[PDB]
RNA sequence: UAAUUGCGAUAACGAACGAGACCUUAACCUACUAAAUAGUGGUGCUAGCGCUGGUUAUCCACUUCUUAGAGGGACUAUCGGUUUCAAGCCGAUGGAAGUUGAGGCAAUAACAGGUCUGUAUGCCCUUAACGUUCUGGGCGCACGCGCGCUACACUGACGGAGCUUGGCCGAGAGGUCUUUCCGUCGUGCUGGGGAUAGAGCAUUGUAAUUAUUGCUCUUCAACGAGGAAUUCCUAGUAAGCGCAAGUCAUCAGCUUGCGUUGAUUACGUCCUGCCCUUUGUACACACC
């Protein structure tokens, strides 16, 4: 075969891509360009695995920089940011 | 005493999954906007055998409804339609999200640049056989449009780790913006070369 | 009371609604509308003509759907809801020719004639 | 299913006893306990002839297959009206003379030719290939219209 | 609305919903048994523990049995299950469910939910319907 | 279960008329004709209930051989015609047995 | 003289000898239909 | 390898001597497959078809011969 | 025009027969006449907190279910169009249009088709034998051909969740006192695929080894979507999920029907089968 990575959970749980580099870069520079992007096509943009980018989300989520909406596959849309209203 | 669904305690009331709105979208294309029609649906669905007939303005289309149809299908064997619609509802979402604008003006959009003006059907005659360059009849442009951003979409699933809703907003968008790394546009420009020569 | 059932049909699945008018709760096998129905986009296509009509409070509808692939339903419940209004006030007959309605297809699985794999179907050997 | 069954083994045992026999035709009424059996038959003297056994003898032999009940049975002679619709006569006549014989292509006209006189709308013979002991060419023939399909 | 919410909720809210509540019963022994494997070819129980094997099939047993009734072990069985003829290559699956079914009916009858009927199959009491729909009225609040 | 009507009181009353034909026509007729006597005897009874089909319907190639389409067609439909009375005399019993029509109609009474 | 069995098994016509056939009426599978153009039974007159 | 609450001891009277079952090997992993191939020799020195075949050398459990085994040799 | 189908001409005037009509029924409409299997309302037992709904109750009603009949059959009277003339073509309404849809009612005669072993009769073998009643064994296979069945993997794979029992009880298979969401997947020849192998357990049967089925358990086989090439199918049809009937002591699925899922293309004759006319013909069991 060709070969292999990004690649989780062992990356996840090991500081390299969770601590900073993957949130900041690969999740939060992303939304500047696109108001919101899908879980799914954010996934496959940025290389990260879905079960890698689905915990980065969640952290990112509590802290309230990023809300979700929902949909059964583990699918929907990821968005950051947001207003006046 | 009510208690009822949640939309807008009312107006007219846009439908098409609740979301999103029809009427806005323009088909730039002149000729190509007679045969899309999109004067009042939704997204629910419908058979109607509205019957071949030829030369005139042939039948209705949804042009959404279409494009579920042929997803399910192609490619290949075993697709169901509760899935199926699942995969565009959420691939309608990504796409406006991606665009930020109506999801069916993006559909149109990739559709009305991936559907050539000419096409290279085979004809033997005498001792060999030529191609000397054929018509497009404006569904037929409509269906091959939708059909290889549906192969594309299919292609990048199974190549690469993606579900298919984002490969089909993808291959979509791409086709929509005019980028040759659309599986759709390519080979528009391909057929279009092709039976531009062969003349 | 208050009873008008007049029974539309339109693919597979038997809707049958006694409708008594009051709030506009509605009730599928008896059991909520929005609750169990869920699995939708095209379940609030029912749900359009308790709303923009604008009379709401008029009709409790209640609904027993039973038998066949979840999808087949939604027409043949609303034919019977329009109907009957049809009836009482004639002058609301712009209801039922506005908002659209009918077909059905009818034509609920097909002859099977042997040898056909699946009936006419022939297979497959020069 | 079941009363189908009672119904499923008795024409056929009816069909196999009332076969070459001189006779003409054979309905069967089932009530309980007895069989009707109506036969139209000239033929019937050789079937009855009172107490003895003979009456009973061909009825009594519907009894033991599958149907029914100690009891006795009933027979009742019957005429003809008019052979054609349903007999065993109108087989057996045509099987006496393909016997020892007579002209075949004649056989095949005059049968036809009786019937029709008595009406019919429609009389349609065939006769096995095999005419004079040669091949196989068969022969068909039929007057006025008829009808099976 | 909560009671009658028993009735009428989309199945799994109701039954999502319904587990945490479960999971305060004492019984739910599982011994042994469901270790070989029990359903097709990947069926083991260590997902079991939140809403698993064991919890939803209680949970849930319970939201088909208001609505519906009278039941049995059998109906049970394959209400979820399949075990479908096979082209002869297959298996899809082999759903067994004898022995589910089973260990989920039994912890019921020790806190005095089921009933069991001489033809009937399974009955709900009063003590059945209680807990299930007194359960129902803090669901409908959260939902809306 | 026992539809009470002297004769030191009846309390035999159950009856089932069970009517099976292969022809329709033949078998409507007869049927017919038991409802009137319900209603002349006395007291009332019910009409005419059919419920349900019984099919057989047997798919057999020929045969040659070879016999590959076109199979040589066959189909049993048949109906099943439930008569009940409301009242069950003896005098209903007899004159109803006595004046059977039945030809091919197979008529069972059944049973107390 | 002495005696046997076995190869006992289901059934068929008197009127057709072979063994192989349709048990519900009784006879074998060809006999069943040239029976089945008779009628007899309540069902078949023919046709579908 | 083998746990707390579980186990499984080899128990019967002697001898029947080969091959026996040792209560269901788990044990799974090179014990499994390195006694396959002593059950193999055992099977034929009991005279079993199973292990005649397994002299012969052939598709054991008689497989279908309209069609196969083309990729197997 | 599917149709010497019907019309208009005509050295013809008829006339049969297939087609159609006819029947079948999947569609249907039912407002109804009929009756209740059943649907639905009124009790009574609760639960939310007769108000809102679940359950079963007593033959109390009417009805889409039921089914037997009726009637509604739908078609260019009926609103319509240039037009030898009868027409074709397309459209309203409706619930579908002039072949309303199936081909299931399919003409005669042929092809030495095919059947003597799915169903008798000539006639030879022959005749207390190719009678007889079995018992044991055979439907192995270096390769070809056929049909069929499962895969290659996300529209996926896993687990859980949306003659027949009741119920104590079982690894599966069984014996009886007894009537579509979400953990999981990481696009991996694997969590793919189940081939093959081997030991061992229950039942069918007297027996399961070449010739049962179900398998606990473990070997983990090829195959990365298939060449030169093929078959059908004109919308509930292709294609796909299953089930029951028959088969049947057992048995791969045969053959076969019911439902369920549900698509694409349908102009035309632009290799093959056919039709009528047309001419030529050295053929005539017929371009083999």
Known sequence: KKKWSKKSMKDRAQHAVILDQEKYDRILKEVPTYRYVSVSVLVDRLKIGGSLARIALRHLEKEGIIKPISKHSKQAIYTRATASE | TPIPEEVQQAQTEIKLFNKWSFEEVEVKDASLVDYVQVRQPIFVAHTAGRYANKRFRKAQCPIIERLTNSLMMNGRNNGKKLKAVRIIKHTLDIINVLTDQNPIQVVVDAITNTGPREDTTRVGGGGAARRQAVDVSPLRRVNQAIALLTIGAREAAFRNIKTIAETLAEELINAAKGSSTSYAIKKKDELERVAKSNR | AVAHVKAGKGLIKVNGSPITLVEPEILRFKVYEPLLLVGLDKFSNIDIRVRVTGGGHVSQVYAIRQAIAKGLVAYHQKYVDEQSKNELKKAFTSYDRTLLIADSRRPEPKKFGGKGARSRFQKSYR | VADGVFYAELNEFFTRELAEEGYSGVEVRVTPTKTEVIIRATRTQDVLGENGRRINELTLLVQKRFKYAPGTIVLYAERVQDRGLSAVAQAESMKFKLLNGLAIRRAAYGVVRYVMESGAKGCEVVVSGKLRAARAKAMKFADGFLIHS | ?144 | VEEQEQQQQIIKIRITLTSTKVKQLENVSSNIVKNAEQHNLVKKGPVRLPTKVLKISTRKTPNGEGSKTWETYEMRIHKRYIDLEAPVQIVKRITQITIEPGVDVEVVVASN | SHPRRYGKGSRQCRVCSSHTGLIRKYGLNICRQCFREKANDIGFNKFR | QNPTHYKIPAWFLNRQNDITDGKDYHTLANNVESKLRDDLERLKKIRAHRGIRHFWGLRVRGQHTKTTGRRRA
């Open chain 5, 1 to 144: 609305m909560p009671g009658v919410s028993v009735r009428d909720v989309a199945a799994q809210d109701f039954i999502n919903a319904y587990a945490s509540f479960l999971q305060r019963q004492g019984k739910l022994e599982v011994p042994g048994y469901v270790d070989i494997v029990k359903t097709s070819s990947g069926n083991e129980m260590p997902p079991q523990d939140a809403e698993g094997w064991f919890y939803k099939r209680a949970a849930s047993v319970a939201r088909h049995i208001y609505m519906r009734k009278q039941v049995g072990v059998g109906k049970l069985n394959k209400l979820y299950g399949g075990a479908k003829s096979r082209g002869v290559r297959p298996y899809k699956h082999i759903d067994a469910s004898g022995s589910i079914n089973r260990k989920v009916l039994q912890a019921l009858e020790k806190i005095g939910i089921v009933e069991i009927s001489p033809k009937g199959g399974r009955r709900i009491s009063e003590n059945g319907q209680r807990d299930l729909d007194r359960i129902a009225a803090q669901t409908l609040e959260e939902d809306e």
